[PDB]
C-alpha cells in the first residue's frame, strides 16, 4: 500500500504477508460472503492498483467468478477511455501524465507511475477508481452466489421468526434494488411470507411498524 | 483507525488485518453478546465514522439485529438534525461547518470532511458521537437477544445458590434500564427469589450486606 | 497503555487487540486460577484507568464474582475518599484536581484528566492506584472460589504424595495467611494429614527436612 | 528481506519466521498450482537472493518439481552469461564489478556482495533479477502440473455449468498463452464444449456473449 | 525487563505479553521436562529480579515443585548473605547499595534498585545471579519429574535400537551428575541394556566406540 | 542474536520468542528431514555462539541424534585447536584473542567474549564458525534419519513415474556426497531404475536431458 505518517512523511510499503493471508483465507473458508465486499474495502485503504490486482490473482478456485470480475474491470476501463481520453503531448520530467483505463486496471502498472500519481497534488486517484470497479464486479458475484429468489424466502413453522428476518435481510443486502423497491420488499414481503400466526401478530402493529417494534412484538408473547 | 503519535500528532491509518479479523470473529462466535459492547469500545478508540461504518458492515449474519441497529442510528441522526440545524449559507474560508446527521453516520460524507472535523479547532469529535449511537443500538440488541426476564428469575429447590446468583447478574447487565433501578434490583429481587431456606439467611444479614457475605453464608443449597 | 519513547516522549496508545484477547481468554476459559492474579498484573501495567476499567469490563461470565470485584473496588473508593477529602474551594488551574474515588475507578473520568495526572511531574499515579484496588479484589475472588479448608485436606489411600502436595500449596496461595501463618501451616498440617505410608517415612526423616528432601523421600510411596 | 527506513536507508532484516511459514503452508495446501506465482511475488516484495534460496530449499516433498526449478535457474544463469559476458581486466574490491549468472543466483557470492549490488546506486538489481528467473521456472512448473487438456473439457450430462466454468478457467490459468490466443480459447472452446442443452441457450443469447450473461443464462442443466 | 535499544540505550519495559504467554503455555503443556530449563533462560533474557519473580509466580499447576523451587531460592539467598554481608552507613544519590539475598530474590522488589544495579557502571548482575539460583532449582525439579530408573531402561525386542538410545540419553539429561559418572554410565549401561543382537555388534566396534559408529552399525539388526 | 542495523550499527539483541518457538516446534513435529538445515539457517541469522548453543539446547526429544551432534561439534572443536594452538602472553587492547574450540562451541564464551569477537576489527565470525559445525552435524543426522538407499530406488511396473522421481530426488538430497557426484547419480541411476516403458522414452531423449524434458515426455502410460 502507501502509508502516510506524521510530519508529512509518505512511504510506499510492501503488502504484509498477514494481510494477504487474511484475504486468501476469507475466500477459502466463507467464499463470496456478504461479509466479503466490505472486508475487501477495509483491507484496500491506501492500496496501489498493482497490489490490489495481486490480491485478486492470489484467490484460489472460483475461477468463473474471477473471470466475471476481470470482465467487469475491462468494461469499466473502456468507459473511462471514452469519457477521458489521454491526450497527446510531451511532458517534463517531474510531471504526471493522465491515466488511461488499462493503466488503471494494472496491465502497464509501473510502480513509479503509481507512486507519482499518489504524491502529485491534487492526487490522481487511480487506486480509488480501480477499487470501485472491483467493488462493482464483486456485487455481481455476490448476487450470483445468493441463489434463492427473494419471493421464495419463507418462515417455516419450526423457525423462530427472528431467524426468518435474518435470512431475508441478508438476501436483500446481496440482491439490491432501487431504494424504493427494497423499502417495498420490507413493507410487503416480510409480513407476507412469515408463518400465519406470526404474520397476524405483525399485522396488528401495522403496515409501517418499525423493525424495532416488529422484533419486540414477535418474540413469543 | 486514528493514531495519536508522539507529541500528540494525529494521523488517519489503515486498520490491521488482525483488528478486523478479531472484531469479525467475536461477532461470528458469540453474536451481539452482552460482552460485545465494551469490546466495541476497546477496539474503536479514535476512528473516522466512515471506517466505523466499515466495521459495522463487515459483520454478516444476524441481520435482523443489524438492520435494527441501522434504523436506530438513522433515528438518532434525525435527532441531531432537529437539535443542530446545519447552515445552508456561506462559511468563512477555513472555518469548518457543523456536521449534519448524515455526515456523522458517514452516509452523506467524504472521508476528508470527517478528518477535517477531527483536525480543525475545535476538533469536533464526530467519530466519538457516531460510536455513542452505535453503542445505544447495540445495548437494545443485547436486550433483544436476552431470553430471560429478571422478574422471572427463580432459584429452584435443587439448584444451588451459586447458579442462581450468576443468572441474576448476567440478566441485570442486559437490563437496559437506569443504573439506580439496577441498584433497587440488587437490594430487592436477589433475596426475594432465592431458595426458601437461603432467603431466610439473606434477610437475617439484612440491608447493607455485601455480596461477599451473601456468598459465604449461602455456600450450597 | 502509555508507551514511553526515546527522548522522554510519553504517548498514550490503543489497547492492543491481541493483549485484550489474551486477558478475556484466560478469565473465560481458566476461571479464577491462582495464575490469574499475576497474569493480570503483567498485562495491566502502564494503563490509563478508564482503559483499565475497559479491560475489566470486556471480560464476561462469572457475573457474581465480577460484581464482587466491583463492590470491592467501591469499598476502596470509599477508603480513598475518606483518607483524601477533596481540596475545598476554588481549584487553581494547571495542576490537576486531586481525584475522588469514583473518578479513580473511571466512571466520571475524562481522557484529558488521565493524561494530565500521568504526565505531571510529580505524577499522580492514578493507573497504579486503581490497579492496586483491582488486584486486592481479585485476591478476594480467588479466596472466595477456593473453598477447601486447608486444615482439613487429607490424602486418599491410593495416592502418590506429590498430587497431595500440589493441592496443598495451591490451596495455601488461595488462603488468607501472613508469611508467619504460612510457615506454621507448612510445619503442622502437611505431614500430619499425609497418607499413612508417606507420613511414617517423613516423621522418621524429621521436621528440619526441607520440601526438596520430603519430595525425595516420597518418590513412589 | 530488505527494509527501507526513513530517508532511504536500506537495511537487511533476518528472514521472518512467519513469512517463511506462510510460504511453506501455501505449498502444503496447493502445491505448484497457478496460485503460487502471485503468492510468491507478494512474499518476495523486498526479498534478497539469500532469502529466495532459503525459500526454495525449505520446501519438503515435491522434490522433482524443486529440482526442475533449480535446473531452470541454471538455464537462466546461462542466458544471462550469453547476453552479459563479464568484461576482462582488473577491478578493485569494493567497486561492485559486474556479476555473472552464478553470483546472481547466489551460491558463489556472499550475502554482503549481493546486498551491495542491489543497494548501491545506480544498482545491479540482483534481487529482482533472481526473482524473475524463479518466476519463469515456476510458470513452467504450473504448466507441467496442469493435468487436464482444455480441448477435452466437457460439461457432463449431470454437471452444473458453474463447476464446468471453474474447471475450464483454472485449466487456462495454469496454461497461459498470448493474450490474443487466450481470448480465442475463451470464445471458441468454452461454449463449444458446454453441455448441448446449455450451448443452444448461449447461441440464442449471442454470437459470443459476456461471461456475466452466460452465467445468468446457464443456471440449470 | 530491560531492553538495549540501538546505540547502547537502556530502556526498562513491561514483560512482553507474548513472552509471558509462551512461558505459561510451556508449564501448562509440557510439565517439568528437561526442555524447560533452557526455554526459561531464553525467554527471561534481560530480566530484572522483579520480572523473574513475575515469571515464577504465573506458574500454576505442579505446585509442590514450585514451592521447592522457592525454598531453594531462599537457601541460595542465605548463601549469598553468608559470603557477603552488608556494611552500615548511608549512600549518596548516585551510588548502589549491596543487596541482601532476599532483595536479589525479589521479596522487597524495589524496581528502582533493580534497574540501578544492572545499569550502574560497573554493574551488579543481580538478575543473572537470581537466574542461576532459579536454574539450580529447576534442575532439581527436572530430576524429581524423571522417575524411571535409568538402570532399568532396556531395549525392547520390538523397538528399534535408536529409540531406546533416545530414551536413555533423555533420561541421562534429566538425571545428570558428575561428568565422570555420566560418561561411565554411557559406556557401561547403554551397550549392556541393548538387545542381544545389537549389543554383540557394539562390542565388536570397540570398548570406546563412538555414538556415531553405534548409530551406523545398528541400522538393520 | 546480534543485529546489524542501518548504517552498520551493531547492537546485541534478545532471542526472539517467536523465532525460538518456530524452531523448536519444527523439530518436535517434523524431526530431522532434509528440510532441517535450511530452516535452521533462516532462524539463526546473526546468532552468537551462545545463542546457537541455546537454540540447540532448547530442542528435546530424539536425543541420541542430539548427543551425536554434540560430539560432531566436539570433533570440529579439536580440529580448530589443532590448527590454532593456545597462545600465551599479553595481547593488544581491543584486538580480541584467537578463540579456542571451547569458546567457539559456546560453553567457555561469556557474553562479553562473544560480543568482543563480532565487534572488534577485524572481526572473527565465531557465530558463523559454530553454525557451520552445527550444519555439518545436522547433515550427518539427516543421513542417519534417511532409511532408503538411493541405489535400491526403482519405479514399479505399476507405480507412476511421477511418484518415483519425487522419491529419488528426496533421497538424493539426504545422501552425503559432492553435488557433482549427486549430478552423476541423477543422470545415471534415475533412468536405469525407471520401468521399462518409461526408460525407453527416456533413452530417446539421450544423454543431456533436463528434468523438464524428461517429466513432460513421461506424461503417458
Q: How many CA atoms lie within 13 A of B120 on its CB side?
A: 17
D8 interfacial to chain A (CB closer than 8 Å): no
Q: What letter does residue A118 receive in the DSSP assignment?
A: H
| C198 beta partners | none
Q: Cα–Cα distance between A47 and A54 in angstroms, integer?
A: 11
Distances (CA, A) of E186 to E176, F61, F76: 12, 18, 22
Compare CB distances from B54 to A3, A42, A216 and report the shortest one's residue: A42
Residues 6+ apart with CB under 8 A from A111: A12, A48, A50
- Is the CB of residue A51 less than 8 Å from the CB of residue A15? yes
Is residue D117 within 8 A of residue D99, CB to CB? The reply is yes
Which of E68, E44, E41, E33 has the alpha carbon at shortest distance from E173? E33
Find the farthest-apart pair of alpha carbons in chain E and give their distance in angstroms, rounded. Answer: 74
Phi-psi region of C134 (alpha: psi -120 to 50; beta: other; left: phi over 0): alpha
Q: How far is Cα C98 from Cα C104, in angstroms, rounded to an integer?
A: 10
Q: What share of residues in chain C are helix, strand, coil (percent, to 5)?
A: 60, 5, 35
Q: What is the structure's resolution, reported in angstroms to one decimal? A: 5.0
Distance CA C47, CA C12 (A): 9
Name residues whose C-beta falls within 8 Å of residue D129's C-beta, 6 or more positions apart in sequence.
D80, D104
Distance from C42 to chain E by nearest Cα, in Å?
7
* Ramachandran class of D167: left when φ > 0, alpha when ψ lies in -120 to 50, beta otherwise: alpha
Structural contact between residues A38 and B57, judged by C-beta atoms closer than 8 angstroms: yes
The three state secondary structure string of chain E is CEEEECCCEEEECCCCHHHHHHHHHHHHHHCCCCCHHHHHHHHCCCCCHHHHHHHHHHCCCCHHHHHHHHHHHHHHHHHHHHHCCCCCCCCCECECCCCCHHHHHCCCCCHHHHHHHHHCCCCCCHHHHHHHHHHHHHHHHHHHCCCCCHHHCCCCCCCCHHHHHHHHHHHHHHCCCCHHHHHHHHHHHHHHCCCHHHHHHHHHHCCCCCHHHHHHHCCCC
Chain C residues whose CB is inside 8 A of the E15 CB are 42
Beta bridge partners of D10: D4
Q: Which residues of F touch D20 (CB under 8 A)?
A: 39, 42
Q: Please, are residues F123 and F98 in contact by the beta-carbon 8 Å criterion?
A: no
d(CA B65, CA A212): 9
Check if E154 contacts F (Cβ < 8 Å).
Answer: no
B211 touches chain C (CB under 8 A): yes
Q: List the single residue in F with minimal CA-CA distance to D56.
A: F38
E55 vs E49: CA distance, rounded Å:
10
d(CA C105, CA C53): 7
Proportion of chain A in helix, strand, coil states, percent, rounded to 5: 60, 5, 35
Experimental technique of record: cryo-EM
Q: How far apart are CA E96 and CA E85, in angstroms?
A: 15
- Nearest to E191, CA basis, from E213, E170, E158, E173: E213
Ramachandran category for residue D204: left, alpha or beta (phi over 0 → left; psi -120 to 50 → alpha): alpha
C-alpha cell at E180: 565422570
Cα separation, B186 vs B208, in Å, equals 11
**Buried/exposed code over A96-118 (b: 16+ C-beta within 10 A; e: otherwise):** eeebbbbbbbbeebeeebbeebb
3-state DSSP call for residue F46?
coil
Q: DSSP string spanning C18-73?
A: HHHHHHHHHHHHH-S-STHHHHHHHHTTT--HHHHHHHHHT--S-HHHHHHHHHHH
Asked if residues F133 and F102 have their Cβ atoms less than 8 Å apart, the reply is no
Pairwise CA distance, residues D90 & D87, whole Å: 9
Rounded to a whole number of angstroms, the distance from the CA of F178 to the nearest CA of chain E is 20
The residues that bridge with E4 in the sheet, in sequence order, are E10
Which one, of A56, A17, A80, A214, lies nearest residue A135 by Cα? A56
Place of cell 512523511: A9
Nearest-CB residue to E42 (from F20, F72, F147): F20
Residue F188: count of CB within 10 angstroms of its CB: 10
Cell readout for A38 is 466490505
After what residue numbers is chain C broken, C–N > 2.5 angstroms? none
> Contact, D198 vs D161, CB < 8 A?
yes
User: In degrees rounded to 5, what are phi and psi of residue E193?
Assistant: -95, 5
Which chain F positions have a beta carbon within 8 Å of D68's beta carbon? 210-212, 215
The CA radius of gyration of chain A, in Å to the nearest whole number, is 23
Q: Please, which residues bridge with residue F9 across strands?
A: F5
Cα Rg of chain C, angstroms: 23
Q: For residue F203, what is the enclosing H or E element?
A: helix F196-205
Q: Identify which of D50, D58, D57 has the alpha carbon closest to the alpha carbon of residue D106.
A: D50
As a whole number of angstroms, the distance between CA F85 and CA F100 comes to 8
Pairing of strands E2-5, D9-12: unpaired
Q: Coil, helix or strand for F96?
A: coil
Substitution target in C43, C63, C65 with the highest count of B β-carbons within 10 Å is: C63
Q: Pick from A184, A183, A182, A216: which is nearest to A202 by CA?
A: A216
Bridge partners (DSSP) listed for residue C11 = C3
Domain boundaries, chain C: 2-144, 150-217
The region that residue D106 occupies, defined by phi over 0 for left and psi between -120 and 50 for alpha, beta otherwise, is: left
CA B45, chain centre distance (Å): 14
E100 vs E122: CA distance, rounded Å: 19
CATH 1.10.375.10 holds for C2-144: yes
Residue E117's nearest CA partner among E47, E173, E58 is E47
DSSP code for B151: G
Which parts of chain A are beta strand (E)?
2-4, 10-12
Alpha-carbon gap, residue D124 to D129, rounded angstroms: 9
Q: How far is CA A31 from the centre of its chain?
A: 14
Question: Phi-psi region for residue E89, left (φ > 0), alpha (ψ -120 to 50) or beta?
Answer: left
CB C84 within 8 A of CB C38: no
Q: Which CATH superfamily is domain A150-217 in?
A: Retrovirus capsid C-terminal domain (1.10.1200.30)
Give the best residue of C3, C11, C17, C21 to mutate against chain B (max B CB count within 10 A). C17
Q: Give, in words, the CATH class of B2-145.
A: mainly alpha
Q: CA B65 to CA A215: how far, in whole Å?
A: 9
Q: Are B179 and B186 in contact, with CB atoms under 8 Å apart?
A: no
Task: DSSP for D108-164, please give it.
Answer: TS-HHHHHHHHHSSS---HHHHHHHHHHHHHHHHHHHH----GGG----SS--HHHH
DSSP of F120-135, one letter per residue?
A: SSS---HHHHHHHHHH
Chain-centroid distance of CA D49 in Å reads 16
Mutual orientation of helices D17-30 and F17-30 as an angle, nearest 10°? 30
Region of residue B206 (phi > 0: left; psi between -120 and 50: alpha; otherwise: beta): left
Can you spell out the DSSP letters for D58-97? H--S-HHHHHHHHHHHHHHHHHHHHH-PPPSS---TTS-P
Could you identify the residue written with the cell 534429566?
E174
Amino acid at each position: 500500500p502507501i502509508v502516510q505518517n506524521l510530519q508529512g512523511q509518505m512511504v510506499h510499503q510492501a503488502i504484509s504477508p498477514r494481510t494477504l493471508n487474511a484475504w486468501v483465507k476469507v475466500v477459502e473458508e466463507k467464499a463470496f460472503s456478504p461479509e466479503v465486499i466490505p472486508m475487501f474495502s477495509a483491507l484496500s485503504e491506501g492500496a496501489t492498483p498493482q497490489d490490489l490486482n495481486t490480491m485478486l490473482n492470489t484467490v484460489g478456485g472460483h475461477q468463473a467468478a474471477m473471470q466475471m470480475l476481470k470482465e467487469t474491470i475491462n468494461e469499466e476501463a473502456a468507459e473511462w477511455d471514452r469519457l477521458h481520453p489521454v491526450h497527446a503531448g510531451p511532458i517534463a520530467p517531474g510531471q504526471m501524465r493522465e491515466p488511461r483505463g488499462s493503466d488503471i486496471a494494472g496491465t502497464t502498472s509501473t510502480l513509479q507511475e503509481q507512486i507519482g500519481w499518489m504524491t502529485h497534488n491534487p492526487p490522481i486517484p487511480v487506486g480509488e477508481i480501480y477499487k470501485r470497479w472491483i467493488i462493482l464486479g464483486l456485487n455481481k458475484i455476490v448476487r450470483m452466489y445468493s441463489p434463492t429468489s427473494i419471493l421464495d424466502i419463507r418462515q417455516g413453522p419450526k423457525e423462530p421468526f427472528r431467524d426468518y428476518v435474518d435470512r431475508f435481510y441478508k438476501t436483500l443486502r446481496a440482491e439490491q434494488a432501487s431504494q424504493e423497491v427494497k423499502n417495498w420488499m420490507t413493507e410487503t414481503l416480510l409480513v407476507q411470507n412469515a408463518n400465519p400466526d406470526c404474520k397476524t401478530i405483525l399485522k396488528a402493529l401495522g403496515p409501517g411498524a418499525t423493525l424495532e417494534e416488529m422484533m419486540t412484538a414477535c418474540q413469543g408473547v
